[PDB]
Amino acid sequence: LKYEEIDCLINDEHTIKGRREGNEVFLPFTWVEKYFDVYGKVVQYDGYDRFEFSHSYSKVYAQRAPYHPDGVFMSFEGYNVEVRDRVKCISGVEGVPLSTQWGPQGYFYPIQIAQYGLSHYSKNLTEKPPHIEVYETAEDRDKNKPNDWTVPKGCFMANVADKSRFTNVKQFIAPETSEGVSLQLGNTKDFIISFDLKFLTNGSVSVVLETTEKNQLFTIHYVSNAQLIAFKERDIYYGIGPRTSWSTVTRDLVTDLRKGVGLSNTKAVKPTKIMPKKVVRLIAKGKGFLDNITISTTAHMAAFFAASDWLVRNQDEKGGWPIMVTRKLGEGFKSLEPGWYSAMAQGQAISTLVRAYLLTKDHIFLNSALRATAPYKFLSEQHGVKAVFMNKHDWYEEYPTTPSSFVLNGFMYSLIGLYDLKETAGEKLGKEARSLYERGMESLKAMLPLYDTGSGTIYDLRHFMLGIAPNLARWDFHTTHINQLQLLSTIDESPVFKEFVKRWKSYLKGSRAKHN
Amino acid sequence: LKYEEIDCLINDEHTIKGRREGNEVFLPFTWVEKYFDVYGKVVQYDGYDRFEFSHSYSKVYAQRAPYHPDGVFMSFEGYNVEVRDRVKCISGVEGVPLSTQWGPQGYFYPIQIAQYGLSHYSKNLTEKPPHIEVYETAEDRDNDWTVPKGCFMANVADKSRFTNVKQFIAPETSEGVSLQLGNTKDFIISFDLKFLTNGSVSVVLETTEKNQLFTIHYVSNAQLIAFKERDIYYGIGPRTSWSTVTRDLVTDLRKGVGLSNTKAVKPTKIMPKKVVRLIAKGKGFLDNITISTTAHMAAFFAASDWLVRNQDEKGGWPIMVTRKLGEGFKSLEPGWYSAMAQGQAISTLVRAYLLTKDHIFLNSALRATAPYKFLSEQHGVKAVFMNKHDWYEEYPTTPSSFVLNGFMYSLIGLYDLKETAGEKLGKEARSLYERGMESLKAMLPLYDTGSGTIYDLRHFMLGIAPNLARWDFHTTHINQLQLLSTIDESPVFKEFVKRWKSYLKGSRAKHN
Numbered sequence A: 001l002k003y004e005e006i007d008c009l010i011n012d013e014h015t016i017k018g019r020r021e022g023n024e025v026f027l028p029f030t031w032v033e034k035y036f037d038v039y040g041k042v043v044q045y046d047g048y049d050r051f052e053f054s055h056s057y058s059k060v061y062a063q064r065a066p067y068h069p070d071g072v073f074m075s076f077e078g079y080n081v082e083v084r085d086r087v088k089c090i091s092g093v094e095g096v097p098l099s100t101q102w103g104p105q106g107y108f109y110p111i112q113i114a115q116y117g118l119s120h121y122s123k124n125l126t127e128k129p130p131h132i133e134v135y136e137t138a139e140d141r142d143k144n145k146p147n148d149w150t151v152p153k154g155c156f157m158a159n160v161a162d163k164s165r166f167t168n169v170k171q172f173i174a175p176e177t178s179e180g181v182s183l184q185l186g187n188t189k190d191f192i193i194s195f196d197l198k199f200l201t202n203g204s205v206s207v208v209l210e211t212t213e214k215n216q217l218f219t220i221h222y223v224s225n226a227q228l229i230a231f232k233e234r235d236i237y238y239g240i241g242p243r244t245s246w247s248t249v250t251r252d253l254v255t256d257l258r259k260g261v262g263l264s265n266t267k268a269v270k271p272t273k274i275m276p277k278k279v280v281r282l283i284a285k286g287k288g289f290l291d292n293i294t295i296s297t298t299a300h301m302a303a304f305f306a307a308s309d310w311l312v313r314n315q316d317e318k319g320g321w322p323i324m325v326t327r328k329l330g331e332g333f334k335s336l337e338p339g340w341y342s343a344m345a346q347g348q349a350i351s352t353l354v355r356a357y358l359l360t361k362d363h364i365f366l367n368s369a370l371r372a373t374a375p376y377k378f379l380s381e382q383h384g385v386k387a388v389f390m391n392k393h394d395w396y397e398e399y400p401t402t403p404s405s406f407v408l409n410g411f412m413y414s415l416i417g418l419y420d421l422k423e424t425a426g427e428k429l430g431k432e433a434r435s436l437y438e439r440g441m442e443s444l445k446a447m448l449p450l451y452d453t454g455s456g457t458i459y460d461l462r463h464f465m466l467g468i469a470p471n472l473a474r475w476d477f478h479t480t481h482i483n484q485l486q487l488l489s490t491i492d493e494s495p496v497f498k499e500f501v502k503r504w505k506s507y508l509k510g511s512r513a514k515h516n
Numbered sequence B: 001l002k003y004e005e006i007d008c009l010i011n012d013e014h015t016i017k018g019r020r021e022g023n024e025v026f027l028p029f030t031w032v033e034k035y036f037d038v039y040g041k042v043v044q045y046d047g048y049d050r051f052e053f054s055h056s057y058s059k060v061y062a063q064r065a066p067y068h069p070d071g072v073f074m075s076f077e078g079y080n081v082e083v084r085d086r087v088k089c090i091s092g093v094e095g096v097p098l099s100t101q102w103g104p105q106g107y108f109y110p111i112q113i114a115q116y117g118l119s120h121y122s123k124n125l126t127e128k129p130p131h132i133e134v135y136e137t138a139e140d141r142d143n144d145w146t147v148p149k150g151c152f153m154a155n156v157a158d159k160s161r162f163t164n165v166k167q168f169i170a171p172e173t174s175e176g177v178s179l180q181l182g183n184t185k186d187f188i189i190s191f192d193l194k195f196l197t198n199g200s201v202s203v204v205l206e207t208t209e210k211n212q213l214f215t216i217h218y219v220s221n222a223q224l225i226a227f228k229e230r231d232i233y234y235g236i237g238p239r240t241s242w243s244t245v246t247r248d249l250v251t252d253l254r255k256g257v258g259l260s261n262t263k264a265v266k267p268t269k270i271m272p273k274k275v276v277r278l279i280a281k282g283k284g285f286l287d288n289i290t291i292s293t294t295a296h297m298a299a300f301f302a303a304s305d306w307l308v309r310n311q312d313e314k315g316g317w318p319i320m321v322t323r324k325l326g327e328g329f330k331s332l333e334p335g336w337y338s339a340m341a342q343g344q345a346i347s348t349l350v351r352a353y354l355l356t357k358d359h360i361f362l363n364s365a366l367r368a369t370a371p372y373k374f375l376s377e378q379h380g381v382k383a384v385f386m387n388k389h390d391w392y393e394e395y396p397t398t399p400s401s402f403v404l405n406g407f408m409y410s411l412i413g414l415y416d417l418k419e420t421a422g423e424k425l426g427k428e429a430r431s432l433y434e435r436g437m438e439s440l441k442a443m444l445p446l447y448d449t450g451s452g453t454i455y456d457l458r459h460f461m462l463g464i465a466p467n468l469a470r471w472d473f474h475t476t477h478i479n480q481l482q483l484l485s486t487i488d489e490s491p492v493f494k495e496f497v498k499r500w501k502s503y504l505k506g507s508r509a510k511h512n
């Protein structure tokens, strides 16, 4: 019985080269992979090779506990927003990501900002507490080389009381055409730098980094202007704004280095493998005050509050976060001009704001969340987010298009937001959220089957709205769909959610609905 | 060819044995076939072996002409209704198939009867004319008759039929009178018959089952079918007035030998290889004894006549069996109507009218639109999708089911009628067709999975998994849309035909 080449005719159209042993035919995975759109590779173990086949990529989140508004946000403990190449950088002034997804010019995308917040919130609950190293308090610390300041000629420093802040602070005076005053740091493990800052004049706070790229030094300059980001090797510049009143500056030096070096005029940051291996020293220029200089493994809550604060300050009078970029969802849909709202933005923002409220009891956050339900009440053409499927089912549009698009995953995020709010706001204040949630959940249960292909899910209902082919959801949207339904199945006991979760999971392993 | 056997882990769940050459891994088709639900086999040609892979089974009809109401019915020239194992037999009395699909007791299913008619109509237009061999006219045509003692035969005039006929008298406790036939090529027997008493006309067949003789008895009672040893019995009814009896001896033999108490006929390989002789018992008359390759028009008119005689006062063909479409749908009690039955019946009746100009057929067709006007709950066939789109239900369930293929057959019927009845008489059909076609265009995308079609909308109506259409229903869907695309110029039909065809070859809608 010979093992030999055999011609394999595919659908009477093309011949590939297979192999035959007796009656058994073997087909090349090169063909299988492309023809069925599946995944595989040879994995090398110690003394053992194994081919490993997968129907899909992407994994379902292993939910540990029922969903609650003050817990982790779905699967976002595993999200890494800032490494996404559509994140140009973390704004120095705002402390939140700028997106370039639909425009190289860059814009604050509320969805991305909410996800930044919610992922950092979730990581705060799941990760080990950070190591925190304190380099300067200007107190009676009063050892451990906290006074390793270099003060060149023409510069001055002092420990001085700040009555307003009930603490001692480090005063510094250093002209910009000088070396500046310099604090030796030397951290090789942790790369989140933090310091309380108040400038009297223009100036900068700079951090020198040893990197993994051939031992070479890069400096990151945090400058008292509004310029976003600049890179002229080996110097990276972020404007952090005037900082003429006390604030805590928190920066991730890994992200700030990678986004600097990777700076691009395109919609995508250049890939780089560069990492900082040592935080060498901090340089202060101009006239001002410093306190509480620290380096931490992580600073999740600072990120979360930067997102929350941004959402409060940037909400408009209609309760919305307008998206200031043109969105063309596809042929047959009208272009959305800048200033459109997204049900996904509203929902993700509400989930952020509700968590901010529950932590602080600061009603400013809750009130912003309550205002954010207003766009759910108005049709897309009335500058809202509401669509109605076949004059029967209310829907909250990720993309408020004409005709309506009915994107599934944005809708479910819009509902989770409403849930967080209605559970938190109390009976009287939460009435509108409760009503929108109940109507929305009724729609979801009725319409879920329209998104099921029998071997996957559809992203939206454009096939029906425009009379074209289904827009099939790629596997990472399919797992998003599962993660969302899995979450909803813990706050609503409807059997339909559990049955759909189970079937949609089976699709990841190549199961199919039965044919007749 | 050198290789290495290599373990192939499938979805982290089970391991199969593959083969590796360099970076290339080859997977066993044994696995591919089952895992992806695909088809393949090694075909041996002279000096060339080739593995031949198919994503699907089932082929799209190669349309040769735009659709017309008096032409072939879609792809039905290729249909073979009578070999289907859910056809218990061709009724002796009625000359149409009896179904056992949803009950072993058997029932006349109007859809199956219409398809019998429409397939034979279509074959009539596409096949070569049959060879017809005439054995007895009782004229001055040319005896091959054996008349045992105690039997009698004569040539006698029949004034009513303007012909001479063969009189026969033969007691049942005798061999009967026998005409030698001897046909080895053709197996459709035909004869004009009139009994004076009870009796039988029997046909002896030489068969492929160890050269054995089997006899098929056409008996003057209403008993459906019986099989004992090498004798098969069909009741053909009293036959006390002249009628033409036409029987397919291949089918009649296979259904006899395959006789079962289940919903499916037993498979058999048995075939007749010779029509030996015809035996007459009792008192009666015979004329025009013939054997033909085919008799398509006799089959077509048996179906048409049955439809005329069995239509009720509401214009419907009631289906006299319980239908349970699935969990979530109320059972349909016997007497329900089907939009597919109404449509297929209309398509049959319209063709019968255009051949004969007999207005009885057109009148029956016109009456058959009435159930399309009434909701399922009012004992009609109409459903309304989301208070917007009229639909004609193959299965008029509660809740509504929206079976695609039945709906399209219901529309083709309305089309046949509106085109044939003229402007005034065809008004109701035209209105129902136009509304229906609007619905079809709007709702087609709901049946598209991106790699196939769904059979119905039960997933949405009941909140469950999609009921995916088998490949043979998917090709039915394509054949129907292809037909509609030749009588309606809407781009949507051409676009859907094209995409749905691509699915047969493993193409998929793009993911985002």
Ligand SMILES: O=C(O)[C@H]1O[C@@H](O[C@H]2[C@H](O)[C@@H](NS(=O)(=O)O)[C@@H](O[C@H]3[C@H](O)[C@@H](O)[C@H](O[C@H]4[C@H](O)[C@@H](NS(=O)(=O)O)[C@@H](O[C@H]5[C@H](O)[C@@H](O)[C@H](O[C@H]6[C@H](O)[C@@H](NS(=O)(=O)O)[C@@H](O[C@H]7[C@H](O)[C@@H](O)[C@H](O)O[C@@H]7C(=O)O)O[C@@H]6CO)O[C@@H]5C(=O)O)O[C@@H]4CO)O[C@@H]3C(=O)O)O[C@@H]2CO)[C@H](O)[C@@H](O)[C@@H]1O
Pocket: A058, A059, A061, A075, A076, A077, A078, A079, A080, A081, A083, A084, A086, A099, A101, A109, A111, A112, A113, A115, A329, A330, A344, A398, A407, A409, A410, A459, A471, A476, A477, A480, B512
């Ligand atoms: O350690 C490791 O192994 C590595 O980890 C890597 O990160 C992992 C991470 O650990 C994983 N987390 S875990 O699974 O939980 O453990 C995992 O996280 C992913 C996750 O799988 C994704 O589901 C998730 O998606 C997010 C989006 O990131 C987010 N975007 S953002 O704006 O906030 O930045 C948001 O997406 C919605 C937004 O509205 C839009 O961005 C998005 O646009 C769609 C568009 O709607 C589509 N339109 S279409 O009409 O259907 O076509 C479509 O459009 C594009 C077409 O696809 C193209 O053909 C066309 O040319 O261009 C079109 C276009 O861009 O316009 O697609 C786009 C883009 O998706 O719509 C979104 C919507 O909701 O509809 O919210 C999503 C859902 O939550 O991102 C997670 C994440 O990155 O955190 O996987 C990642 C890896 O991928 C590390 O990166 C690595 O360093 C480690 O080594």
Ligand SMILES: O=C(O)[C@H]1O[C@@H](O[C@H]2[C@H](O)[C@@H](NS(=O)(=O)O)[C@@H](O[C@H]3[C@H](O)[C@@H](O)[C@H](O[C@H]4[C@H](O)[C@@H](NS(=O)(=O)O)[C@@H](O[C@H]5[C@H](O)[C@@H](O)[C@H](O[C@H]6[C@H](O)[C@@H](NS(=O)(=O)O)[C@@H](O[C@H]7[C@H](O)[C@@H](O)[C@H](O)O[C@@H]7C(=O)O)O[C@@H]6CO)O[C@@H]5C(=O)O)O[C@@H]4CO)O[C@@H]3C(=O)O)O[C@@H]2CO)[C@H](O)[C@@H](O)[C@@H]1O
Pocket: A516, B058, B059, B075, B076, B077, B078, B079, B080, B081, B083, B084, B086, B099, B101, B109, B111, B112, B113, B115, B325, B326, B340, B394, B403, B405, B406, B455, B467, B472, B473, B476
């Ligand atoms: O050439 C040779 O060598 C061989 O040829 C062989 O025949 C070929 C033939 O040449 C082909 N023709 S060609 O393509 O033109 O070249 C081809 O003909 C087929 C064709 O592919 C089919 O599309 C066609 O389907 C017909 C039906 O036969 C017909 N039925 S009948 O009543 O008239 O007898 C009619 O079907 C509708 C009826 O209302 C019902 O019968 C039917 O019931 C469905 C039911 O609705 C489904 N329900 S579900 O809730 O969705 O599941 C489903 O139900 C069954 C489930 O599948 C099972 O799981 C369960 O256990 O049992 C369920 C049940 O039975 O209840 O399926 C059933 C059955 O389909 O609904 C129909 C509807 O319209 O919805 O109309 C159909 C479409 O026109 O049949 C053609 C034919 O046979 O003529 O293919 C054959 C290959 O077989 C010879 O056979 C061979 O001898 C030669 O050697």
Ligand SMILES: *[C@@H]1O[C@H](CO)[C@@H](O[C@@H]2O[C@H](CO)[C@@H](O[C@@H]3O[C@H](CO[C@H]4O[C@H](CO)[C@@H](O)[C@H](O)[C@@H]4O)[C@@H](O)[C@H](O[C@H]4O[C@H](CO)[C@@H](O)[C@H](O)[C@@H]4O[C@@H]4O[C@H](CO)[C@@H](O)[C@H](O)[C@H]4NC(C)=O)[C@@H]3O)[C@H](O)[C@H]2NC(C)=O)[C@H](O)[C@H]1NC(C)=O
Pocket: B123, B124, B125, B126, B127, B128, B129, B130, B132, B134, B135, B136, B137, B141, B142, B288, B289, B290, B294, B295, B296, B297
């Ligand atoms: C599809 O369906 C069509 C339509 O049915 C079919 O065409 C018909 O084919 C049949 C074949 O049997 C033809 O029937 C014959 O009709 C003869 C008289 O018909 C006249 O009128 C029609 C129009 O109405 C004219 O077009 C036609 O040209 C004629 O002028 C009739 O004489 C025949 O009767 C003889 O044969 C039968 C058995 O078939 C027998 O029982 C009779 O006793 C009679 O005896 C024999 O006569 C023939 C002479 O025809 C003679 O050769 C023979 O020797 C005699 N036998 C003996 C022993 O002496 C018969 O009824 C019909 O005309 C066709 N119609 C049309 C419109 O073409 C197609 O063939 C079908 N195709 C397929 C693929 O299924």
Ligand SMILES: *[C@@H]1O[C@H](CO)[C@@H](O[C@@H]2O[C@H](CO)[C@@H](O[C@@H]3O[C@H](CO[C@H]4O[C@H](CO)[C@@H](O)[C@H](O)[C@@H]4O[C@@H]4O[C@H](CO)[C@@H](O)[C@H](O)[C@H]4NC(C)=O)[C@@H](O)[C@H](O)[C@@H]3O)[C@H](O)[C@H]2NC(C)=O)[C@H](O)[C@H]1NC(C)=O
Pocket: A123, A124, A125, A126, A127, A128, A129, A130, A132, A134, A137, A139, A140, A141, A292, A293, A294, A298, A299, A300, A301
């Ligand atoms: C998820 O988020 C929660 C809530 O935010 C975190 O828990 C909180 O952790 C923080 C610790 O960062 C804790 O904060 C208090 O901070 C006070 C600040 O005072 C001192 O620490 C800072 C540096 O962190 C310095 O800048 C100050 O100058 C103070 O320095 C002290 O004095 C000497 C110098 O002379 C210094 O060497 C000492 O190390 C330092 N002393 C101490 C005790 O740090 C503290 O006064 C106070 O004790 C807290 O540390 C806050 O209380 C936590 N809240 C809760 C509810 O637990 C989680 O860590 C976070 N988890 C994850 C995984 O992200």
Ligand SMILES: *[C@@H]1O[C@H](CO)[C@@H](O[C@@H]2O[C@H](CO)[C@@H](O[C@@H]3O[C@H](CO[C@H]4O[C@H](CO)[C@@H](O)[C@H](O)[C@@H]4O)[C@@H](O)[C@H](O[C@H]4O[C@H](CO)[C@@H](O)[C@H](O)[C@@H]4O)[C@@H]3O)[C@H](O)[C@H]2NC(C)=O)[C@H](O)[C@H]1NC(C)=O
Pocket: A162, A164, A165, A166, A167, A169, A196, A197, A246, A291, A292
């Ligand atoms: C560097 O990091 C340290 C943290 O380690 C910061 O020092 C803390 O600063 C905060 C405020 O800036 C101080 O908290 C304030 O306490 C005031 C009263 O403090 C007295 O009483 C306490 C004991 O109860 C004594 O320990 C203390 O010495 C004082 O005698 C309050 O009046 C302040 O709150 C007021 O306003 C809020 C509303 O916003 C109300 O909630 C209050 O009721 C009140 O009206 C405030 O809470 C804290 O004492 C400092 N800690 C230490 C250990 O010194 C530095 O500020 C930081 N550096 C910079 C520049 O920010």
Ligand SMILES: *[C@@H]1O[C@H](CO)[C@@H](O[C@@H]2O[C@H](CO)[C@@H](O[C@@H]3O[C@H](CO[C@H]4O[C@H](CO)[C@@H](O)[C@H](O)[C@@H]4O)[C@@H](O)[C@H](O[C@H]4O[C@H](CO)[C@@H](O)[C@H](O)[C@@H]4O)[C@@H]3O)[C@H](O)[C@H]2NC(C)=O)[C@H](O)[C@H]1NC(C)=O
Pocket: B158, B160, B161, B162, B163, B165, B192, B193, B242, B286, B287, B288
């Ligand atoms: C075996 O097969 C043969 C066919 O080969 C059948 O014989 C035919 O039978 C039919 C019907 O019985 C005969 O058709 C009838 O012919 C009548 C007159 O025939 C001739 O005679 C007149 C003159 O007297 C001529 O003018 C005429 O042109 C004919 O040449 C017609 O009067 C009949 O008319 C029909 O229509 C009118 C209404 O429009 C009715 O009133 C009548 O009742 C009838 O329906 C009719 O056309 C045909 O002539 C026979 N052909 C031959 C060659 O004999 C046998 O009947 C069949 N055997 C059996 C048992 O059925």
Ligand SMILES: *[C@@H]1O[C@H](CO)[C@@H](O[C@@H]2O[C@H](CO)[C@@H](O)[C@H](O)[C@H]2NC(C)=O)[C@H](O)[C@H]1NC(C)=O
Pocket: A200, A201, A202, A242, A244
């Ligand atoms: C930092 O420098 C800018 C100039 O680049 C200063 O901005 C000016 O401020 C004065 C008020 O004192 C205004 O009248 C000018 O119009 C501003 N000019 C520009 C170009 O913005 C800024 O004041 C400096 N910062 C501090 C703390 O003094």
Ligand SMILES: *[C@@H]1O[C@H](CO)[C@@H](O)[C@H](O)[C@H]1NC(C)=O
Pocket: B170, B171, B172, B173, B198, B199, B200, B281, B282, B283
């Ligand atoms: C007619 O039926 C009777 C019994 O009902 C039977 O005795 C007789 O054999 C039958 N006659 C013929 C000719 O078959």
Ligand SMILES: [Ca+2]
Pocket: A137, A138, A139, A167, A168, A169, A291, A292
């Ligand atoms: Ca201090």
Ligand SMILES: [Ca+2]
Pocket: B137, B138, B139, B163, B164, B165, B287, B288
């Ligand atoms: Ca005669």
